[PDB]
Design an enzyme around this catalytic site. Sequence first.
Site, PDB file in Angstrom:
ATOM      1  N   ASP A 189     -59.090  -9.928 -13.410  1.00 44.75           N
ATOM      2  CA  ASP A 189     -59.629 -10.129 -14.775  1.00 44.75           C
ATOM      3  C   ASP A 189     -61.060  -9.672 -14.714  1.00 44.75           C
ATOM      4  O   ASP A 189     -61.948 -10.381 -14.233  1.00 44.75           O
ATOM      5  CB  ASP A 189     -59.550 -11.586 -15.228  1.00 44.75           C
ATOM      6  CG  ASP A 189     -60.153 -11.833 -16.625  1.00 44.75           C
ATOM      7  OD1 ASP A 189     -60.546 -10.870 -17.331  1.00 44.75           O
ATOM      8  OD2 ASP A 189     -60.209 -13.034 -17.008  1.00 44.75           O
ATOM      9  N   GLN A 218     -56.695 -20.586 -10.044  1.00 41.98           N
ATOM     10  CA  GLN A 218     -57.143 -21.002 -11.402  1.00 41.98           C
ATOM     11  C   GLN A 218     -58.589 -20.531 -11.599  1.00 41.98           C
ATOM     12  O   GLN A 218     -59.540 -21.290 -11.447  1.00 41.98           O
ATOM     13  CB  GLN A 218     -57.014 -22.511 -11.611  1.00 41.98           C
ATOM     14  CG  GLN A 218     -56.174 -23.159 -10.550  1.00 41.98           C
ATOM     15  CD  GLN A 218     -56.019 -24.681 -10.688  1.00 41.98           C
ATOM     16  OE1 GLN A 218     -55.817 -25.221 -11.793  1.00 41.98           O
ATOM     17  NE2 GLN A 218     -56.091 -25.376  -9.545  1.00 41.98           N
ATOM     18  N   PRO A 219     -58.750 -19.243 -11.896  1.00 39.23           N
ATOM     19  CA  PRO A 219     -60.082 -18.653 -11.961  1.00 39.23           C
ATOM     20  C   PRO A 219     -60.865 -18.970 -13.238  1.00 39.23           C
ATOM     21  O   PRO A 219     -62.004 -18.509 -13.391  1.00 39.23           O
ATOM     22  CB  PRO A 219     -59.785 -17.169 -11.878  1.00 39.23           C
ATOM     23  CG  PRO A 219     -58.367 -17.003 -12.346  1.00 39.23           C
ATOM     24  CD  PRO A 219     -57.665 -18.254 -12.119  1.00 39.23           C
ATOM     25  N   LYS A 220     -60.272 -19.728 -14.152  1.00 37.51           N
ATOM     26  CA  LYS A 220     -60.925 -19.984 -15.422  1.00 37.51           C
ATOM     27  C   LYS A 220     -61.133 -21.467 -15.472  1.00 37.51           C
ATOM     28  O   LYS A 220     -60.527 -22.100 -16.268  1.00 37.51           O
ATOM     29  CB  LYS A 220     -60.040 -19.504 -16.596  1.00 37.51           C
ATOM     30  CG  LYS A 220     -60.230 -17.985 -16.985  1.00 37.51           C
ATOM     31  CD  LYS A 220     -59.383 -17.465 -18.242  1.00 37.51           C
ATOM     32  CE  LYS A 220     -59.971 -16.180 -18.777  1.00 37.51           C
ATOM     33  NZ  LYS A 220     -59.262 -15.554 -19.926  1.00 37.51           N
ATOM     34  N   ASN A 221     -61.977 -22.017 -14.608  1.00 40.01           N
ATOM     35  CA  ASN A 221     -62.125 -23.472 -14.353  1.00 40.01           C
ATOM     36  C   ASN A 221     -63.563 -23.620 -13.809  1.00 40.01           C
ATOM     37  O   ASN A 221     -63.912 -23.046 -12.785  1.00 40.01           O
ATOM     38  CB  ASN A 221     -61.038 -23.951 -13.355  1.00 40.01           C
ATOM     39  CG  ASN A 221     -61.257 -25.409 -12.794  1.00 40.01           C
ATOM     40  OD1 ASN A 221     -62.369 -25.797 -12.421  1.00 40.01           O
ATOM     41  ND2 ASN A 221     -60.159 -26.186 -12.691  1.00 40.01           N
TER      42      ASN A 221
END
Lengths: 315, 401
Positions: free
Chosen positions: A142, A108-111
């Site tokens: 990304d 979960q790289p967008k946290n």
Amino acid sequence: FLSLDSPTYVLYRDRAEWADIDPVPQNDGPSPVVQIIYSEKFRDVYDYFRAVLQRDERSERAFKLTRDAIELNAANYTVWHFRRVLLRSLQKDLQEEMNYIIAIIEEQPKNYQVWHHRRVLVEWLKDPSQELEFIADILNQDAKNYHAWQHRQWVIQEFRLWDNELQYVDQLLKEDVRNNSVWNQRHFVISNTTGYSDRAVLEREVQYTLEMIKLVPHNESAWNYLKGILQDRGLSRYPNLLNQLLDLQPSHSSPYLIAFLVDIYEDMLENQCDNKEDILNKALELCEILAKEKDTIRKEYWRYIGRSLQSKHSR
Amino acid sequence: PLYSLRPEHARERLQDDSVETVTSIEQAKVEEKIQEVFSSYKFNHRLVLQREKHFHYLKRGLRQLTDAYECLDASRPWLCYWILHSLELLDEPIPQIVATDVCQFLELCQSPDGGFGGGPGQYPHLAPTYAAVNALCIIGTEEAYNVINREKLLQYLYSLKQPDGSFLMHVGGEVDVRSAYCAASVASLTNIITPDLFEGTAEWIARCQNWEGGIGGVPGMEAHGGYTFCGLAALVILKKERSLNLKSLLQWVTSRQMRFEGGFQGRCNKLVDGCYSFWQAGLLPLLHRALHAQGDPALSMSHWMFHQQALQEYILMCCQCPAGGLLDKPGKSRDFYHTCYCLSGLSIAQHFGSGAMLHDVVMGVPENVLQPTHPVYNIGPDKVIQATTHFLQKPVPGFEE
Ligand SMILES: C/C(=C\COP(=O)(O)OP(=O)(O)O)CC/C=C(\C)CNC(=O)CCCC[C@@H]1SC[C@@H]2NC(=O)N[C@@H]21
Ligand SMILES: [Zn+2]
């Protein structure tokens, strides 16, 4: 040890090792709003997380419990805080914790909570050895992940790790010349190392950006970079620039070029050049071409720019 | 017609210069999809905010959510704020019993250390603190105002404040511009600002403005709509907007509006998304107010410096979900955040006002008009006033004496 997907997963309330402790239910009060009907695995883990928290139990079992609670909601900064406290009290191995967070971020790289955790680990370990290659692999999935660039910049500033960044930057520009995060990085890097005043630098930079603009005329990032490195020098100290851009026009037009030409003319007019009236007319002509025809989305911006130019370059 | 349906509008499609990168492949994927949506209106001849559907979505969400929402279990005051605000823009009155339940809920989210957490018993954090205070203001009752422990709120803010002017998002937390905005928003509404509370902050926020003209989340970072909204709005509260270079900031926002899609992107060379209908376009009123205060003679007196019409067209045609609620873009699933910010976006794009001018632009049927939102706080202007009033009846703690 006991996984949430195991066929033989057993609720905490049904575990003999937790018999000594009472679950603490969430108090949402008597008519809740925004009430989440939690699944049963969830409520059960969080009922026990609450109980462990409430008594501040610094147990290895509380530590494993936090892992579960994070798996169920990686955004619960209360849980992460408690985990950091435990990491300290149980005096845990931070290398495995580093591997834990690596896997989590990959998932979960967008946290926010998870990058920040990793960062706190790196401050504790004062050891950036893994950081850039880690970051590079996220960026490889990304290339614009904002947290990953932030973290990159933070490592680089703190552990002064400037020496290869312009190399990495050049490579990513080769991969996607439209990657604004990478032009921001180029700028970040250059202004921190050499600066832009050394003439040799500024020339390599301007030449490069122009090579890039010619290759891809409608890439705004290049144009934004060009304006950024130059505008503050003053555009009009570079008399060749006006002509070099007029040359592109026929073969490589784009509203960005037209806009730049206006930026030059505005610098000219500020700097009391000859043909004031003629320059001002070229500018207002271009604004009108933008507002009416080549960039109508900004029709309101361009009409305010024309009206500003008239307002202050007059009698 | 509508701007997006006119035949010259096709000349606004992406020009990749014959050079494909991921950036253009992705932009073309979106534009092609938005072209479908535009063509779908143009088969039979008609622009309508499905208010009734949005309301059902909101009314239900405000009470109960499935376990699909386990991941917002630490963001529940955000859900109150997003939903209340959306109802407020839709001119939907909020029942006494709903209002009271929210008060009581937000009361359990309130920390004894001051501030609010993501839910009952969670630690305080600037974001839910911000959301809860906004939710409480939208309610606007005396019950709601009184939920807020102001003295602990200040202590709580003091605890987050950094030597260099920034704020921690929470204890043991991270910094970015969001904390500054949250702190200012909250501190100003509750009348708890002291001499030294925001000391350094303006200069900190200013160091976040970068070579693009926009502001990044921390000094050195890429300019982004959300962080740029937060910075500017935080300066406007503190009245130190002039720390920033506004001419470059203007050039940057205006540029964020997408020529084909009509809506805004968050940062350069990325994709359109409905929430930036608020975070990006809300910068225009803030800048209008700032440039007006500096004496600017060339400011429009009917319009903000974006394509208001095109933005409303984007929101109405691409960001409504037929079942209710609103979207980032087509293909995406509804949520309350996007419901909130698309609508806040729409209201901004409808309602111009400056000094004594007022000029509305309501695309589609006139029942499309929303209520106005305050562009600093993104709750209603009435609610801002009422709340700043109420909390001015109190001294900044302390003193007093
Ligand atoms: C990192 C970032 C954007 C990253 O976007 P991205 O890469 O996914 O997309 P994009 O291409 O940049 O559009 C900054 C955006 C900032 C704002 C919109 C300013 N935000 C706020 O004031 C708070 C909004 C709350 C969002 C929810 S709250 C629960 C969840 N937790 C969290 O931290 N964020 C979300
Ligand atoms: Zn969005």
